[PDB]
Amino acid sequence: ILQHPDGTVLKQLQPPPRGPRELEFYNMVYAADCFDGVLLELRKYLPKYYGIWSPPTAPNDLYLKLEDVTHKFNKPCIMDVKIGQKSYDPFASSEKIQQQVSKYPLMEEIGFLVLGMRVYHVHSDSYETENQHYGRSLTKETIKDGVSRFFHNGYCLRKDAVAASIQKIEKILQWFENQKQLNFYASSLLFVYEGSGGEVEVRMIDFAHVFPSNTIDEGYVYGLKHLISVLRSILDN
Ligand SMILES: Cc1cc(C)cc(-c2onc3ccc(/C=C/C(=O)O)cc23)c1
């Protein structure tokens, strides 16, 4: 993720087939001739897409130019949460499935995985960051506290941002409960709230493993519902 002063991020296409699939996902959703109500609604929950971008002198080098969802924040607090029971896709080999399940064997049980967070602390005027190993450490016993950490600014628990997050996730959940044409594996929700101020963003990202489907995305829904339940329990802290 390259953050550009103009309010965008550049995301480099991952190696094939992942990068190409993500490009084609954005292209389908943001097709200027799209009249599919499901895809038109989905746009609300993605970063705005500004098309494929390559350096003037390097057409080999493929990026997605995307909206920087954090741009309108002063001190953005950022959490990336992978959603679903499976982070392997329907065409994974047995080895690929193990690779993926072994990354976090609780994925089936919990339905989400914190990929990281960046949390502004007011008292120190500083950020604390958690990496992939944080979320992968979390168990049924510690997931609630693990998520809570995102909404603690070193003085209070930001229950406003928690409530706002539930409300925005609910709209995404509603989108998933009214579509049976896409299934999303290893995709994430990006949570942003203002650390320095009620603004909150919850957007879907990471579409290297979105596939056509004829079913509800039950794994994604499970994850959304479990994540909401956790956030809801945090409101009782
Ligand atoms: C500073 C910072 C940190 C992180 C983790 C994400 C972002 C971020 O802000 N707007 C973002 C928009 C998109 C993506 C990735 C999209 C994809 O994989 O499809 C990431 C973003 C910004």
Author numbering: 65 to 260, 376 to 416
Quote the original article:
Compound 1 IC50 values suggest more potency toward IPMK (IC50 = 12.8 nM) than either of the related kinases IP3K-A (IC50 = 8000 nM) or IP6K1 (IC50 = 146 nM), with compound 1 having approximately 10-fold selectivity for IPMK over IP6K1. Compound 1 directly bound IPMK with K d = 11 nM by isothermal titration calorimetry, consistent with the IC50 value. Compound 1 contains three chemical moieties: the benzisoxazole ring that we call the core, with moieties A (acrylic acid) and B (dimethylphenyl) on either side. The core of compound 1 formed four hydrogen bonds with the IPMK hinge region, including three hydrogen bonds with IPMK backbone residues and one hydrogen bond with the carboxylic group of Asp132. The crystal structure of compound 1 with IPMK also revealed that moiety A penetrated a subpocket that is contoured by three hydrophobic IPMK residues (Leu130, Iso384, and Phe386). The four polar amino acids in the IPMK back pocket (Lys75, Glu86, Tyr90, and Asp385) also formed a hydrogen bond network with moiety A of compound 1. Thus, we named residues Lys75, Glu86, and Tyr90 the “KEY motif,” with this motif specific to inositol phosphate kinases. Together with the hinge region, IPMK anchored compound 1 with two hydrogen bond clusters, suggesting a two-point anchoring recognition mechanism. The core of compound 1 also forms several hydrophobic interactions with residues Ile65, Val73, Pro111, and Leu254 of IPMK, also observed in the complex of ATP with IPMK. In addition, Leu130, Ile384, and Phe386 are close enough to form van der Waals contacts with moiety A. For moiety B, Gln67, Thr134, Ile142, Asp144, and Leu254 are within van der Waals contact range.
Inositol polyphosphate multikinase (IPMK) is a ubiquitously expressed kinase that has been linked to several cancers, − and loss of IPMK kinase activity in cells decreases cell growth and proliferation in several human cell lines. The first crystal structure of any IPMK orthologue published was that of the yeast ipk2, followed by the plant Arabidopsis thaliana orthologue. These structures established that IPMK has the typical kinase fold, containing an N-terminal lobe and a C-terminal lobe with the ATP-binding site at the interface between these two lobes. Here, we solved the X-ray crystal structures of 14 of this new generation of compounds complexed with the kinase domain of human IPMK. The structures solved here show a polar contact cluster in this region, which together with essential polar contacts from the hinge region suggests the two-point anchoring ligand binding mechanism proposed here to synergistically enhance the potency of the IPMK inhibitors.
